[PDB]
Amino acid sequence: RSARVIIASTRASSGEDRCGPIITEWLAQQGFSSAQPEVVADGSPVGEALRKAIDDDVDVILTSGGTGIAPTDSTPDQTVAVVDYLIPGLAEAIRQSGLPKVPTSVLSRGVCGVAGQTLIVNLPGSPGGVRDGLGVLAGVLDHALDQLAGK
Amino acid sequence: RSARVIIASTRASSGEDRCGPIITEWLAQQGFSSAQPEVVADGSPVGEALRKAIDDDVDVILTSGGTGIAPTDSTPDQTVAVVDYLIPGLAEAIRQSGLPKVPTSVLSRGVCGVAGQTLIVNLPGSPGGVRDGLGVLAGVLDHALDQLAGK
Amino acid sequence: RSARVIIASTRASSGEDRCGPIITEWLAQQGFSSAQPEVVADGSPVGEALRKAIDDDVDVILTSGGTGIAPTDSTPDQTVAVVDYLIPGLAEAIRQSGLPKVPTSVLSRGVCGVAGQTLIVNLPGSPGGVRDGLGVLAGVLDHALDQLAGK
């Protein structure tokens, strides 16, 4: 029942992350043990934070930020590079949870995937997007982790 | 108007498949001619059963099983390896047909695609998922086959 | 605020395109400047028309046609070959806009993506599909272009 949180934000990694605390709280509410979230710059540092977490063999890695189409948004690409495979239906459920209230939800490129025995979920970079996505994870995360482990 | 059914289940291929009969029945109801379903183990045997079916030049191949995130679920990967291209909107429609009743529907990695003149559809591995997916195919399969053939 | 329109149709490129005028009108209504739409044959000519447009450094390229599963429908493949990355949530929103009225909407393989500073959107090849898709673009296109440019 272990988790890691990574906040992808160059803006926040050098000087405020609001999404970390929200995710930490949700994980505690949901019974997960987790370290303080790693706040890292966009790009290669996301890939590195991911690799560190996977090497920790945690059950789930939740990222927030860097999933839009802005020049520096490379969280999904960094994530694709470390997973064994993707789960596009989960990423689409997370997008759709922002709909129809935030039409721009369809612009998130966030992916979900599995590296070994670790589920990885890209959440959006806003607190409202994060809550939306976590609401989706609440309905499935337990079953996913169990299905991942093989009942 | 030809079809092939492949059941991807190591559990069923060595000792009960409930999904085969359902699919066979739906195909008969829908006017398709088809051979008895091939029940095969997860992994390479799915890829082989697929290649055999494509070489039979059937119009449609329906698979059931091995589309989740459990360690041995490699039907989508075996399918990606044999198709010329994918049809992600059809695979998403099939996932969404399980919603909102079975939230875990979003975990299916099943794909749809075309190999030459053969449409391939990954269905879920449960009988209820299969019925859900077949209900989606009922609204489009005829048109798809026709669009595939070029009116 | 610049745009380019490409109509992918071998049928129309040799002898009537109804989708071009619709898109041109929508772009004018939405404040975009744009050249007369390029009508081109399926395949390599779509890729070429795309490259020409990207080299023009326009803000948005809208294509119509060649997104189904018929043998010659290669607009999405030509588009994947020129973009730096894809935006699958936008392409799914466009498919879903045809639903539930036109169940075959799920068969469109159209993609959306970014080449450098240029957003590219594959629309369907029918006038009703085009209107459906443009209705989706109306809710997000401005924000997308802005997010693309970095606020």
Short mmCIF file of C-alpha atoms in Angstrom, two decimals:
data_model
loop_
_atom_site.label_atom_id
_atom_site.label_comp_id
_atom_site.label_asym_id
_atom_site.label_seq_id
_atom_site.Cartn_x
_atom_site.Cartn_y
_atom_site.Cartn_z
CA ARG A 1 0.00 0.00 0.00
CA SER A 2 2.78 2.48 -0.91
CA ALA A 3 2.73 5.62 -3.01
CA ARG A 4 4.95 8.40 -4.33
CA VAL A 5 3.95 11.88 -5.44
CA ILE A 6 5.79 13.90 -8.05
CA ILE A 7 4.94 17.52 -8.86
CA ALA A 8 6.17 18.55 -12.27
CA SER A 9 6.60 22.30 -12.22
CA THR A 10 9.63 24.39 -13.12
CA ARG A 11 7.64 27.39 -11.80
CA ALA A 12 7.06 25.71 -8.39
CA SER A 13 10.46 23.92 -8.16
CA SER A 14 12.34 27.26 -8.03
CA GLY A 15 9.81 29.41 -6.11
CA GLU A 16 3.89 27.55 -4.57
CA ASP A 17 2.62 24.00 -5.11
CA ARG A 18 -0.97 23.58 -4.09
CA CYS A 19 -1.47 20.13 -5.68
CA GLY A 20 1.05 18.18 -3.54
CA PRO A 21 -0.80 18.71 -0.22
CA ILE A 22 -4.12 17.71 -1.86
CA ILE A 23 -2.65 14.47 -3.20
CA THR A 24 -0.84 13.67 0.06
CA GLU A 25 -4.14 14.18 1.94
CA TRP A 26 -6.11 11.97 -0.49
CA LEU A 27 -3.46 9.23 -0.18
CA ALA A 28 -3.61 9.36 3.66
CA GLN A 29 -7.46 9.35 3.54
CA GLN A 30 -7.23 6.31 1.19
CA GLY A 31 -4.83 4.36 3.49
CA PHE A 32 -1.57 4.75 1.48
CA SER A 33 1.86 5.32 3.05
CA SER A 34 3.90 7.92 1.14
CA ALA A 35 6.99 10.13 1.30
CA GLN A 36 6.84 13.95 1.02
CA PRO A 37 6.15 14.81 -2.66
CA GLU A 38 9.17 15.47 -4.90
CA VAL A 39 8.76 18.89 -6.60
CA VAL A 40 10.87 18.86 -9.79
CA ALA A 41 11.43 20.93 -12.93
CA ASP A 42 9.77 19.96 -16.22
CA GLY A 43 11.59 17.57 -18.55
CA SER A 44 14.44 15.21 -17.61
CA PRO A 45 13.92 15.80 -13.84
CA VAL A 46 10.40 14.26 -14.06
CA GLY A 47 11.88 11.16 -15.75
CA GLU A 48 14.50 10.93 -13.01
CA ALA A 49 11.97 11.35 -10.16
CA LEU A 50 9.90 8.62 -11.82
CA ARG A 51 12.86 6.24 -12.06
CA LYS A 52 13.75 6.86 -8.40
CA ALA A 53 10.17 6.06 -7.37
CA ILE A 54 9.92 2.89 -9.47
CA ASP A 55 13.25 1.77 -7.89
CA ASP A 56 11.56 2.28 -4.52
CA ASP A 57 9.03 -0.36 -5.68
CA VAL A 58 5.99 1.62 -4.61
CA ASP A 59 2.52 0.46 -5.62
CA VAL A 60 1.45 3.77 -7.15
CA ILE A 61 3.03 6.96 -8.46
CA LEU A 62 0.85 10.00 -8.93
CA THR A 63 2.20 12.94 -10.84
CA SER A 64 0.69 16.41 -11.17
CA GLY A 65 1.61 19.03 -13.73
CA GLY A 66 3.22 19.33 -17.13
CA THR A 67 0.44 17.49 -19.04
CA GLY A 68 -0.90 20.31 -21.28
CA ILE A 69 0.34 21.47 -24.68
CA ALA A 70 2.52 24.40 -23.43
CA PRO A 71 6.16 24.20 -24.66
CA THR A 72 7.65 22.72 -21.45
CA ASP A 73 4.86 20.13 -20.74
CA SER A 74 6.73 16.85 -21.05
CA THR A 75 5.41 14.79 -18.13
CA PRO A 76 3.50 12.41 -20.45
CA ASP A 77 6.58 11.87 -22.63
CA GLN A 78 8.79 11.27 -19.59
CA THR A 79 6.19 8.81 -18.33
CA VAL A 80 5.82 6.90 -21.63
CA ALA A 81 9.62 6.41 -21.54
CA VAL A 82 9.50 4.55 -18.22
CA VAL A 83 6.35 2.41 -18.38
CA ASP A 84 6.09 -1.15 -19.74
CA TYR A 85 2.64 -0.33 -21.08
CA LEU A 86 -0.18 2.24 -21.00
CA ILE A 87 -3.83 2.17 -19.84
CA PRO A 88 -5.51 4.70 -22.18
CA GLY A 89 -9.04 4.17 -20.77
CA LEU A 90 -7.92 5.41 -17.34
CA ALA A 91 -6.26 8.54 -18.79
CA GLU A 92 -9.44 9.18 -20.81
CA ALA A 93 -11.64 8.75 -17.71
CA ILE A 94 -9.49 11.41 -15.94
CA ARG A 95 -9.90 13.87 -18.87
CA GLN A 96 -13.65 13.22 -19.02
CA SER A 97 -14.01 13.89 -15.26
CA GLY A 98 -13.25 17.57 -16.07
CA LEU A 99 -16.12 17.63 -18.54
CA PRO A 100 -18.26 19.43 -19.34
CA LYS A 101 -17.30 22.06 -16.69
CA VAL A 102 -13.77 22.69 -18.04
CA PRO A 103 -13.85 22.10 -21.86
CA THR A 104 -10.02 22.46 -21.94
CA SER A 105 -9.76 19.15 -20.01
CA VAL A 106 -9.55 17.52 -23.46
CA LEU A 107 -6.17 19.20 -23.92
CA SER A 108 -4.45 17.15 -21.16
CA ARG A 109 -1.95 14.64 -22.66
CA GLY A 110 -1.50 12.87 -19.32
CA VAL A 111 -1.05 9.09 -19.53
CA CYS A 112 -1.49 6.18 -17.15
CA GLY A 113 0.70 3.12 -17.23
CA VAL A 114 2.45 0.27 -15.47
CA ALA A 115 6.19 -0.05 -14.80
CA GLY A 116 6.78 -3.57 -13.46
CA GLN A 117 4.45 -3.74 -10.43
CA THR A 118 3.94 0.04 -10.21
CA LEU A 119 0.91 1.92 -11.48
CA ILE A 120 1.66 5.39 -12.74
CA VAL A 121 -1.04 8.07 -13.16
CA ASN A 122 -0.54 11.54 -14.70
CA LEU A 123 -2.94 14.03 -13.10
CA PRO A 124 -3.48 17.61 -14.36
CA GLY A 125 -1.55 20.50 -12.95
CA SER A 126 -4.42 22.41 -11.35
CA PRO A 127 -5.94 21.62 -7.91
CA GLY A 128 -9.46 21.25 -9.42
CA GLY A 129 -8.14 18.92 -12.12
CA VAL A 130 -6.33 16.95 -9.43
CA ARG A 131 -9.53 16.56 -7.37
CA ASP A 132 -11.43 15.55 -10.54
CA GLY A 133 -8.81 12.90 -11.36
CA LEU A 134 -8.52 11.59 -7.83
CA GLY A 135 -12.33 11.15 -7.84
CA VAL A 136 -11.85 8.78 -10.83
CA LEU A 137 -8.99 6.96 -9.06
CA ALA A 138 -11.22 6.50 -6.00
CA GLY A 139 -13.58 4.27 -8.03
CA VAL A 140 -10.88 2.00 -9.48
CA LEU A 141 -7.47 2.32 -7.86
CA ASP A 142 -7.92 -0.50 -5.34
CA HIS A 143 -9.16 -2.89 -8.06
CA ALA A 144 -6.35 -1.80 -10.39
CA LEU A 145 -3.68 -2.50 -7.83
CA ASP A 146 -5.26 -5.86 -7.12
CA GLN A 147 -5.59 -6.72 -10.82
CA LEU A 148 -1.98 -5.65 -11.25
CA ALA A 149 -0.86 -8.04 -8.49
CA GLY A 150 -3.06 -10.82 -9.94
CA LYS A 151 -5.99 -11.01 -7.48
CA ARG B 1 -19.57 -12.42 -44.05
CA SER B 2 -16.98 -14.55 -42.20
CA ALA B 3 -15.72 -14.42 -38.64
CA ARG B 4 -13.27 -16.07 -36.25
CA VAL B 5 -13.40 -16.16 -32.47
CA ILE B 6 -10.35 -16.38 -30.24
CA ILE B 7 -10.56 -16.82 -26.46
CA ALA B 8 -7.40 -15.73 -24.72
CA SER B 9 -7.24 -17.58 -21.44
CA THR B 10 -4.45 -19.72 -20.01
CA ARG B 11 -6.91 -20.62 -17.21
CA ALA B 12 -9.56 -21.84 -19.71
CA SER B 13 -7.13 -23.36 -22.28
CA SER B 14 -5.93 -25.99 -19.77
CA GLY B 15 -9.16 -26.60 -17.80
CA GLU B 16 -14.53 -23.20 -18.49
CA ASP B 17 -15.00 -20.58 -21.22
CA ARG B 18 -18.34 -18.88 -21.02
CA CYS B 19 -17.54 -16.08 -23.50
CA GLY B 20 -17.02 -18.25 -26.62
CA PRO B 21 -20.64 -19.54 -26.76
CA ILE B 22 -21.98 -15.98 -26.28
CA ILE B 23 -19.88 -14.66 -29.16
CA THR B 24 -20.68 -17.62 -31.42
CA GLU B 25 -24.41 -17.04 -30.73
CA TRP B 26 -24.18 -13.29 -31.45
CA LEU B 27 -22.33 -13.99 -34.71
CA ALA B 28 -25.01 -16.52 -35.82
CA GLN B 29 -27.80 -14.06 -34.80
CA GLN B 30 -25.96 -11.37 -36.86
CA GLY B 31 -25.64 -13.57 -39.99
CA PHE B 32 -21.89 -14.41 -39.81
CA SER B 33 -20.40 -17.81 -40.69
CA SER B 34 -17.69 -18.88 -38.21
CA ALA B 35 -15.57 -21.81 -37.05
CA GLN B 36 -15.62 -23.11 -33.45
CA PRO B 37 -13.71 -20.59 -31.27
CA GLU B 38 -9.99 -21.23 -30.71
CA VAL B 39 -9.27 -21.26 -26.94
CA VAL B 40 -5.57 -20.42 -26.45
CA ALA B 41 -3.13 -19.53 -23.68
CA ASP B 42 -2.14 -15.90 -23.05
CA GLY B 43 0.86 -14.47 -24.93
CA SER B 44 2.42 -15.88 -28.10
CA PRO B 45 -0.50 -18.33 -28.68
CA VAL B 46 -2.91 -15.37 -29.10
CA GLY B 47 -0.59 -13.86 -31.75
CA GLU B 48 -0.46 -17.22 -33.52
CA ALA B 49 -4.26 -17.74 -33.43
CA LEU B 50 -4.60 -14.21 -34.84
CA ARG B 51 -2.16 -14.89 -37.69
CA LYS B 52 -3.96 -18.14 -38.55
CA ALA B 53 -7.28 -16.29 -38.70
CA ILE B 54 -5.96 -13.42 -40.83
CA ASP B 55 -4.51 -16.06 -43.22
CA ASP B 56 -8.03 -17.49 -43.44
CA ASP B 57 -9.05 -14.05 -44.81
CA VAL B 58 -12.09 -13.71 -42.59
CA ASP B 59 -13.96 -10.41 -42.42
CA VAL B 60 -13.85 -10.10 -38.63
CA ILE B 61 -11.90 -11.52 -35.70
CA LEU B 62 -13.32 -11.13 -32.23
CA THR B 63 -11.13 -11.91 -29.27
CA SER B 64 -12.14 -12.19 -25.62
CA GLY B 65 -9.83 -12.14 -22.64
CA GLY B 66 -6.38 -10.98 -21.66
CA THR B 67 -7.12 -7.23 -21.99
CA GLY B 68 -6.71 -6.07 -18.35
CA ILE B 69 -3.56 -5.05 -16.49
CA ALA B 70 -2.87 -8.45 -14.80
CA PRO B 71 0.67 -9.79 -15.50
CA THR B 72 -0.31 -12.24 -18.28
CA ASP B 73 -2.77 -9.92 -20.16
CA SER B 74 -1.08 -9.51 -23.51
CA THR B 75 -3.93 -9.78 -26.01
CA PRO B 76 -3.73 -6.07 -26.93
CA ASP B 77 0.04 -6.29 -27.49
CA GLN B 78 -0.33 -9.44 -29.59
CA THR B 79 -3.02 -7.64 -31.58
CA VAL B 80 -1.04 -4.42 -32.14
CA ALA B 81 1.75 -6.63 -33.59
CA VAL B 82 -0.50 -8.01 -36.34
CA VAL B 83 -2.66 -5.06 -37.43
CA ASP B 84 -1.84 -2.51 -40.15
CA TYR B 85 -3.54 0.17 -38.08
CA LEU B 86 -5.76 0.80 -35.06
CA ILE B 87 -9.26 2.30 -34.57
CA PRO B 88 -9.03 3.85 -31.07
CA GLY B 89 -12.58 5.32 -31.11
CA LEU B 90 -14.07 1.81 -31.40
CA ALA B 91 -11.98 0.46 -28.50
CA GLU B 92 -13.02 3.50 -26.44
CA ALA B 93 -16.71 2.97 -27.29
CA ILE B 94 -16.37 -0.64 -26.01
CA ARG B 95 -14.80 0.55 -22.70
CA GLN B 96 -17.47 3.23 -22.29
CA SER B 97 -20.27 0.66 -22.82
CA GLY B 98 -19.29 -0.79 -19.40
CA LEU B 99 -19.77 2.60 -17.80
CA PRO B 100 -20.89 3.72 -15.36
CA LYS B 101 -22.03 0.26 -14.08
CA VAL B 102 -18.52 -1.28 -13.97
CA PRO B 103 -16.02 1.56 -13.23
CA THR B 104 -13.13 -0.89 -13.84
CA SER B 105 -14.11 -0.97 -17.56
CA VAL B 106 -11.60 1.88 -17.97
CA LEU B 107 -8.83 -0.60 -17.15
CA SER B 108 -9.33 -2.65 -20.36
CA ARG B 109 -6.38 -2.15 -22.78
CA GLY B 110 -8.21 -3.92 -25.61
CA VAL B 111 -7.62 -2.49 -29.09
CA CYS B 112 -9.44 -2.61 -32.41
CA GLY B 113 -7.65 -2.63 -35.72
CA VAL B 114 -7.43 -3.71 -39.34
CA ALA B 115 -5.09 -6.33 -40.80
CA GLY B 116 -5.43 -6.13 -44.59
CA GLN B 117 -9.18 -6.64 -45.15
CA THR B 118 -9.83 -8.05 -41.66
CA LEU B 119 -11.30 -6.10 -38.76
CA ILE B 120 -10.02 -7.17 -35.38
CA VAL B 121 -11.83 -6.33 -32.12
CA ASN B 122 -10.54 -7.06 -28.58
CA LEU B 123 -13.48 -7.67 -26.22
CA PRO B 124 -13.16 -7.99 -22.42
CA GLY B 125 -12.75 -11.32 -20.75
CA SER B 126 -16.02 -11.41 -18.81
CA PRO B 127 -19.43 -12.44 -20.27
CA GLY B 128 -21.02 -9.11 -19.21
CA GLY B 129 -18.16 -7.14 -20.77
CA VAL B 130 -18.55 -9.25 -23.92
CA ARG B 131 -22.29 -8.48 -24.13
CA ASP B 132 -21.56 -4.77 -23.53
CA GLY B 133 -18.97 -4.74 -26.33
CA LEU B 134 -21.07 -6.74 -28.76
CA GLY B 135 -23.88 -4.20 -28.18
CA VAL B 136 -21.46 -1.51 -29.48
CA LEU B 137 -20.44 -3.70 -32.44
CA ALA B 138 -24.13 -4.18 -33.30
CA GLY B 139 -24.46 -0.44 -34.06
CA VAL B 140 -21.41 -0.19 -36.34
CA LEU B 141 -19.96 -3.52 -37.44
CA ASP B 142 -21.89 -3.76 -40.73
CA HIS B 143 -20.92 -0.18 -41.69
CA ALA B 144 -17.30 -0.80 -40.65
CA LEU B 145 -17.01 -3.88 -42.80
CA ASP B 146 -18.54 -1.99 -45.69
CA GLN B 147 -16.29 1.05 -45.17
CA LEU B 148 -13.35 -1.33 -44.98
CA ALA B 149 -14.28 -2.88 -48.34
CA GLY B 150 -14.86 0.60 -49.83
CA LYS B 151 -18.68 0.85 -50.07
CA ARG C 1 -4.34 34.25 -35.85
CA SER C 2 -3.57 32.30 -39.06
CA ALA C 3 -5.01 29.09 -40.44
CA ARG C 4 -4.73 26.66 -43.34
CA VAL C 5 -7.35 24.25 -44.64
CA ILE C 6 -6.56 20.97 -46.36
CA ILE C 7 -9.22 18.76 -47.94
CA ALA C 8 -8.07 15.20 -48.33
CA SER C 9 -10.08 13.67 -51.13
CA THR C 10 -8.89 11.89 -54.25
CA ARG C 11 -12.55 11.91 -55.37
CA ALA C 12 -12.82 15.72 -54.98
CA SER C 13 -9.25 16.57 -56.13
CA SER C 14 -9.95 15.24 -59.66
CA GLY C 15 -13.65 16.17 -60.04
CA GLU C 16 -17.29 18.53 -55.35
CA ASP C 17 -15.91 19.56 -51.95
CA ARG C 18 -18.58 20.78 -49.62
CA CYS C 19 -16.41 20.78 -46.46
CA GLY C 20 -13.88 23.45 -47.54
CA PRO C 21 -16.43 26.31 -47.75
CA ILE C 22 -17.87 25.35 -44.32
CA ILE C 23 -14.43 25.43 -42.71
CA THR C 24 -13.42 28.66 -44.45
CA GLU C 25 -16.67 30.26 -43.20
CA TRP C 26 -16.15 29.04 -39.62
CA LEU C 27 -12.57 30.37 -39.65
CA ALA C 28 -13.74 33.81 -40.91
CA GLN C 29 -16.57 33.84 -38.29
CA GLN C 30 -13.92 32.96 -35.64
CA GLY C 31 -11.52 35.77 -36.69
CA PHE C 32 -8.82 33.68 -38.46
CA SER C 33 -7.02 34.76 -41.65
CA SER C 34 -6.62 31.87 -44.13
CA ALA C 35 -5.73 31.00 -47.72
CA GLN C 36 -8.12 29.17 -50.07
CA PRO C 37 -8.23 25.48 -48.98
CA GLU C 38 -5.82 23.08 -50.70
CA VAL C 39 -7.80 20.13 -52.15
CA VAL C 40 -5.40 17.17 -52.49
CA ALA C 41 -5.46 13.44 -53.21
CA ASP C 42 -5.26 10.90 -50.38
CA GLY C 43 -1.83 9.71 -49.22
CA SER C 44 1.50 11.45 -49.86
CA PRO C 45 -0.21 14.66 -51.14
CA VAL C 46 -1.82 15.20 -47.70
CA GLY C 47 1.63 14.91 -46.05
CA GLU C 48 3.02 17.41 -48.56
CA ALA C 49 0.15 19.91 -48.09
CA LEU C 50 0.71 19.60 -44.33
CA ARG C 51 4.46 20.28 -44.64
CA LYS C 52 3.80 23.31 -46.85
CA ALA C 53 1.37 24.70 -44.27
CA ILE C 54 3.67 24.11 -41.29
CA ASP C 55 6.44 25.91 -43.28
CA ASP C 56 4.01 28.82 -43.61
CA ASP C 57 4.05 28.95 -39.77
CA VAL C 58 0.30 29.19 -39.41
CA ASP C 59 -1.32 28.86 -35.99
CA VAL C 60 -3.77 26.14 -36.99
CA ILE C 61 -4.23 23.57 -39.74
CA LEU C 62 -7.61 21.96 -40.16
CA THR C 63 -7.93 18.95 -42.41
CA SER C 64 -11.11 17.26 -43.60
CA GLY C 65 -11.39 13.82 -45.12
CA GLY C 66 -9.51 10.55 -45.28
CA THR C 67 -9.96 9.67 -41.57
CA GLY C 68 -12.12 6.51 -41.82
CA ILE C 69 -11.05 2.89 -42.31
CA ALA C 70 -11.56 2.74 -46.13
CA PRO C 71 -8.41 1.59 -48.02
CA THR C 72 -7.21 5.07 -49.08
CA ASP C 73 -7.86 6.88 -45.73
CA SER C 74 -4.37 7.90 -44.68
CA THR C 75 -4.82 11.45 -43.37
CA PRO C 76 -4.18 10.40 -39.75
CA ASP C 77 -1.00 8.54 -40.73
CA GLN C 78 0.24 11.48 -42.80
CA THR C 79 -0.50 13.72 -39.83
CA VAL C 80 1.24 11.53 -37.23
CA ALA C 81 4.36 11.69 -39.47
CA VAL C 82 4.57 15.49 -39.24
CA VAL C 83 3.59 16.33 -35.65
CA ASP C 84 5.93 16.58 -32.65
CA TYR C 85 3.20 15.14 -30.46
CA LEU C 86 -0.50 14.23 -30.32
CA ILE C 87 -3.47 15.44 -28.22
CA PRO C 88 -5.68 12.32 -28.02
CA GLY C 89 -8.34 13.93 -25.77
CA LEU C 90 -9.15 16.50 -28.48
CA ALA C 91 -9.48 13.83 -31.19
CA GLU C 92 -11.73 11.83 -28.84
CA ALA C 93 -13.89 14.90 -28.11
CA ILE C 94 -14.38 15.33 -31.90
CA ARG C 95 -15.46 11.66 -32.30
CA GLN C 96 -17.80 11.92 -29.32
CA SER C 97 -19.45 15.07 -30.76
CA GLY C 98 -20.95 12.78 -33.47
CA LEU C 99 -22.49 10.60 -30.78
CA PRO C 100 -24.99 9.20 -30.28
CA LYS C 101 -26.58 10.49 -33.56
CA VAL C 102 -23.99 8.89 -35.89
CA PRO C 103 -22.71 5.66 -34.19
CA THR C 104 -20.07 5.31 -36.95
CA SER C 105 -18.32 8.43 -35.55
CA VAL C 106 -16.28 5.97 -33.47
CA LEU C 107 -14.69 4.74 -36.69
CA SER C 108 -12.84 8.04 -37.38
CA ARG C 109 -9.05 7.64 -36.88
CA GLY C 110 -8.47 11.39 -37.09
CA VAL C 111 -5.75 12.76 -34.80
CA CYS C 112 -4.89 16.14 -33.35
CA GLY C 113 -1.35 17.26 -32.74
CA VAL C 114 1.26 19.99 -32.58
CA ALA C 115 4.07 20.61 -35.08
CA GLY C 116 6.34 23.28 -33.57
CA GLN C 117 3.94 26.17 -32.89
CA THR C 118 1.17 24.83 -35.15
CA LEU C 119 -1.92 22.98 -33.96
CA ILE C 120 -3.19 20.38 -36.37
CA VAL C 121 -6.74 18.98 -36.22
CA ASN C 122 -8.12 16.12 -38.37
CA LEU C 123 -11.85 16.61 -38.96
CA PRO C 124 -14.14 14.00 -40.58
CA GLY C 125 -14.85 14.02 -44.26
CA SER C 126 -18.57 14.77 -44.14
CA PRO C 127 -20.10 18.28 -43.74
CA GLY C 128 -22.10 17.18 -40.64
CA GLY C 129 -18.99 15.64 -39.07
CA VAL C 130 -17.11 18.85 -39.86
CA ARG C 131 -19.78 20.99 -38.13
CA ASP C 132 -19.76 18.59 -35.15
CA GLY C 133 -15.96 18.86 -34.85
CA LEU C 134 -15.84 22.60 -35.34
CA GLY C 135 -18.40 22.90 -32.50
CA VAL C 136 -15.82 21.15 -30.25
CA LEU C 137 -13.01 23.42 -31.52
CA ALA C 138 -15.17 26.46 -30.74
CA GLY C 139 -15.04 25.62 -27.01
CA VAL C 140 -11.25 25.16 -26.80
CA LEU C 141 -9.32 26.39 -29.84
CA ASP C 142 -8.56 29.87 -28.48
CA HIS C 143 -7.32 28.43 -25.16
CA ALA C 144 -5.30 25.76 -26.99
CA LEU C 145 -3.54 28.29 -29.16
CA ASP C 146 -2.82 30.39 -26.09
CA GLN C 147 -1.59 27.39 -24.07
CA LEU C 148 0.55 26.43 -27.06
CA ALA C 149 2.15 29.90 -27.12
CA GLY C 150 2.60 29.80 -23.31
CA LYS C 151 -0.09 32.22 -22.03
#
